[PDB]
Amino acid sequence: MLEMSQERPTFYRQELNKTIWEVPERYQNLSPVGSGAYGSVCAAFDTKTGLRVAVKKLSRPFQSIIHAKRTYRELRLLKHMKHENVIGLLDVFTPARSLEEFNDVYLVTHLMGADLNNIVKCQKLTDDHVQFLIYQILRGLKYIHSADIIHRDLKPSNLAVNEDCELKILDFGLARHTDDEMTGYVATRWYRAPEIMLNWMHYNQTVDIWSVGCIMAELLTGRTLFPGTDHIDQLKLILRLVGTPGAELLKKISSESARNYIQSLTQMPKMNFANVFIGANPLAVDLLEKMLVLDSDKRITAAQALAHAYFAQYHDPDDEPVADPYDQSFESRDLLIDEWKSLTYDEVISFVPPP
């Protein structure tokens, strides 16, 4: 009824594009397909499950306090996700037989066919296609938010889609974007809620819904909603559509510099979305209105959005599950390199495979 030991499988070694790979026999025909900066990934066949998978060998994972904590953070997040519309962890392993020998971490996930950009480039999406894609994003977000997890960087490139229009949210852990990466005419910022683009206040769940808003608008119009050339140009694009802040919002803006700046802008009324998204399903227009609200406190939540008439064909309250609590205390904890490395090691060897 219990089980008290673990069977360490047999590993095999090989050099793939300058680097060594030590993986379980299980995984066959490895072929390099890229990097990312946090390591390189090979595509492989998992003969034990019959799945095409992505194997990621983390790169210098315990290089510093910061990197060792990134590593641990990513492993904790991925280990936690158990939902259809969210990237889950298929396997995680190290060839090391003890903590003394522990150096490398390999992460295994579903091999992803295409992301939302790839989908959008190969064809034009119908309204029903958009209903289904957004529903799924929101179904996954409900789950994510249940556990007080903020994705914080929702993007078409972070959304995998398959031949059946099924979708998963990708890219959680990840090293936060740097200032230079967020600078200029770049997709890395076009989907950001303004609260966090200019650091108006302390942010939360609600920033993800703004991102969904931008994504949905783009899928319907075929155009980036707020393609600013820089932080300020982007702000102007947003206030144009959504209106300059009223009094209640200005208060919630901690920073007084932001406040002073905002006020220096000629005021503007919300535009009529019906005239901005001409020809769109009126239910989509109404939903957008409820998503793209400047004051984050009054944004519709994922749970509520799933009940919106726009998703009538897919909504089913008994098939929209919630997550087990996710303990994030470690984010506030200060430890040494070898201490994050040990926590990480403990998480590797305690992995329980899916059914």
From Swiss-Prot:
Chemical reaction(s) catalysed: L-seryl-[protein] + ATP = O-phospho-L-seryl-[protein] + ADP + H(+); L-threonyl-[protein] + ATP = O-phospho-L-threonyl-[protein] + ADP + H(+)
Protein name: Mitogen-activated protein kinase 14
Organism: Homo sapiens (Human)
Keywords from the UniProt entry: Acetylation, Apoptosis, ATP-binding, Cytoplasm, Kinase, Nucleotide-binding, Nucleus, Phosphoprotein, Serine/threonine-protein kinase, Stress response, Transcription, Transcription regulation, Transferase, Ubl conjugation
One GO BP: p38MAPK cascade
Subcellular location field: Cytoplasm; Nucleus
Result when mutating residue 340 to R: Loss of kinase activity
Active site (UniProt): 171
Modified residues (N6-acetyllysine): 56, 155
GO terms for MF: ATP binding; enzyme binding; MAP kinase activity; MAP kinase kinase activity; mitogen-activated protein kinase p38 binding; NFAT protein binding; protein phosphatase binding; protein serine kinase activity
Residue numbers bearing the N-acetylserine modification: 5
Description of how activity is regulated: Activated by cell stresses such as DNA damage, heat shock, osmotic shock, anisomycin and sodium arsenite, as well as pro-inflammatory stimuli such as bacterial lipopolysaccharide (LPS) and interleukin-1. Activation occurs through dual phosphorylation of Thr-183 and Tyr-185 by either of two dual specificity kinases, MAP2K3/MKK3 or MAP2K6/MKK6, and potentially also MAP2K4/MKK4, as well as by TAB1-mediated autophosphorylation.
Modification type Phosphotyrosine: residues: 185, 326
SUPFAM superfamilies given in the database record: Protein kinase-like (PK-like)
Impact when changing residue 330 to L: Emulation of the active state. Increase in activity
